[PDB]
Symmetry: C4
Subunit: 238 residues, 4 copies
């Protein structure tokens, strides 16, 4: 809690990027999920594969656009893990998780505004365990999946160069984006997308469903527990 | 600005021929993919919307890679406009590019019609318009926010140090830009078609020539230009100290 | 670099010259195999959307191209395509000797790769077009020729735009290439051209297929797949050398 | 030299094997889970398609190898290790340790899938490789020898020359091409045997799924890849690659 950062000008820009990023990340991804679901014709949409690209591809573009500014996180769990590694200050982190949180809700909120009809009607792009999977699994998938995301993140951090005015490493976007893409190609059937507390959170809010809200804890505990293990594995044993 | 001193430069007429030819191939490959997909009788026998998304984002990547060193690689009126507002492109240059791009599009699109007039007219001619189930206000919303993703990336992709030939127009990273065109398409095709191109929407509107299309055509210019503006401002005024 | 004297048998004597040939042979053998095997696997599929679909095919072609140019860039210059060669020849980046040997290699290569797939699955191989280019119903020969010309232009123009000014292949003046852009160029063009004749843009890839499949209907249209890419090749070359860089 | 009694004694040496173990583990978890999720799908086109599966396999390799080059040299594959061993770039000791780690990482990954979705997992081929109806075991072996050649020849072509891993004198590999190799081969071999080119990946799926029909053909995915890996090695080391 070195409150000296708040005073820096750059620090406020970094939060603004993370907010807009996540706003963007959530709008594009979720708008895509829906555009799929509302499709009447067979193979007439982009498909679950299309969705998967949306998620890892946006991440890639975003981490690219904001790497040099905030360090391109767009994910609480990504911040959390980098925090446990102490490459981010307690002050910075809590500010980030908030901006991503507010980022998501506006991102998802925006879509519902463009297509409220099919929005509510088709899941509203809200994470929740799928028929045939116990919560025990949904959490397992979520944990291990986020381990892949974060472990990539650490492996893709520039050791020398850091975010403008800070000791927060530059993230090489391509591997991270792909990692996201991959984890989506496997976890979608389980509980759609995840490994992103702010993504699920932003979705649960604008959708508003007890069923949704009930499983919502998994998408916070899993991503965070994974990010934890990841940091551990990468620093304590590598 | 208005420095007519450029017109006289030999490099200036190339960066325009490139943008012209670049945008011609762009519309040809993409629109051709669109028709090709639509005329498909076999279910799941085409490349699908996912295929079309790639044809766009993909062409942008390639076309920008090819022409970045020469014209700076814009291929998009809204991308030029945004940098123009950033004062990284003269007003004189901008107006030329823009004419060559709209001029490139119309030929590119018209070449697809020449290839297969039959299924071309029959399946939308690859022109943007508002999809049933959406209000013109939303189409414009998606168009703005869509283009904000494209141009904000163009800004995030500019090269600080080196530039184009004969100018101070930055070389652009091709991949992040292509992926952006791609991403935006995956989410906007259901609504309008992923316009985020004026020159692209114009070329096909011109060649398809449908009133229903010409009607919504105004959104595809206003939306992009607005998005690009807000992007420029966001990158320049809000970010970049 | 100086324009390499037009016919200097002198390279024949070079050990690296023959290596580059082989690399180009084997590369086209793998190119055709991985791709044509993919095409077949898609056609033989009984289940709706049980194959990889056309997008899957489009990738096979762009993808392998990417991978192959990467793997051979420093050994032969990464051509894998008579039309790319011919195009690099007109700009005098490649001697008339290498260009002719490369060409012979790519075909011999193409004919093996395909033949090797037919050897893996003869039934469906023959039952589903043999992975050969030909004009699709509802498209007149002239459009076929146009698509191929224009398509190849896209491929070649990118090759030129991908060549490295200060980095060349091993023991040669031939320019080294950036495989990713080139790969994508091939990918893109297929997405647009498959519906038409195929994604040709490869005299060798078309020839090897026609050879092993061997159909009158195929052999009839085959000429398009040579003239189209070359003309396209030439124009990109002229475009890049003459009206630009 | 060869035996190298001293490799065991190094602290980095053990680190690598771990990476390789965690690596191969993830790989199988992510791919296999994708395969199942696809198969157990009820809706038509409701899944990611075989294309997604192919991507899963190539993409994972890409990513995984990007995370493990500097540490272990990013093999994640016996065939790749074997091929790199024949090129004397990986000692006999490190090759044996690597393969165990890769086999042990594999089964865990596959098992981890089963545990999550035992139901559809057993009902849909368990994601293990086997010759499919219509193809003769001979073709399966060729497609597997030829498909691995593509993989190993790329690994060899991605090989960095003036750079190595952390403390081992083992080459860092450029990830993207390799992943695409894996992606491509998958696109052409899946319909035949689902594109193995990975002893570790095949073995682990045969272990966890436990089927005779499967164990029957299980020799193809061991004999093939290694033969491919070796041929590649000979093409690249001997008949090519000089200055
Ligand atoms: Hg939060
Ligand atoms: Hg908000
Ligand atoms: Hg990873
Ligand atoms: Hg214009
Ligand atoms: Hg025109
Ligand atoms: Hg962006
Ligand atoms: Hg030939
Ligand atoms: Hg042959
Ligand atoms: Hg091009
Ligand atoms: Hg083993
Ligand atoms: Hg195990
Ligand atoms: Hg290769």
């Amino acid at each position: 809690f070195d409150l000296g950062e708040l005073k820096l000008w750059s620090f406020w820009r970094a939060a603004i990027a993370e907010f807009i990023a996540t706003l963007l990340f959530l709008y594009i991804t979720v708008a895509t999920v829906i555009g799929h679901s509302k499709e009447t014709v067979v193979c007439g949409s982009v498909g679950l594969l299309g969705i998967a690209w949306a998620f890892g591809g946006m991440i890639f573009v975003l981490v690219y656009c904001t790497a040099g500014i905030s360090g391109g996180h767009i994910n609480p769990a990504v911040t959390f893990g980098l925090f446990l590694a102490r490459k981010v200050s307690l002050l910075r982190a809590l500010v980030y998780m908030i901006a991503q949180c507010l980022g998501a809700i506006c991102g998802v909120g925006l879509v519902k505004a463009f297509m409220k009809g099919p929005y509510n009607q088709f899941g509203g792009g809200a994470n929740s365990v799928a028929l045939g999977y116990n919560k025990g699994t949904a959490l397992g998938a979520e944990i291990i999946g986020t381990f892949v995301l974060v472990y990539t993140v650490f492996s893709a951090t520039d050791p020398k160069r850091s975010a403008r005015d800070s000791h927060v490493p530059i993230l090489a976007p391509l591997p991270i984006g792909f990692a996201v893409f991959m984890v989506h190609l496997a976890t979608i059937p389980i509980t759609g997308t995840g490994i992103n507390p702010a993504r699920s959170f932003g979705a649960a809010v604008i959708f508003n469903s007890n069923k949704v809200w009930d499983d919502q804890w998994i998408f916070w505990v899993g991503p965070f527990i994974g990010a934890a293990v990841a940091a551990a594995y990468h620093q304590y044993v590598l």
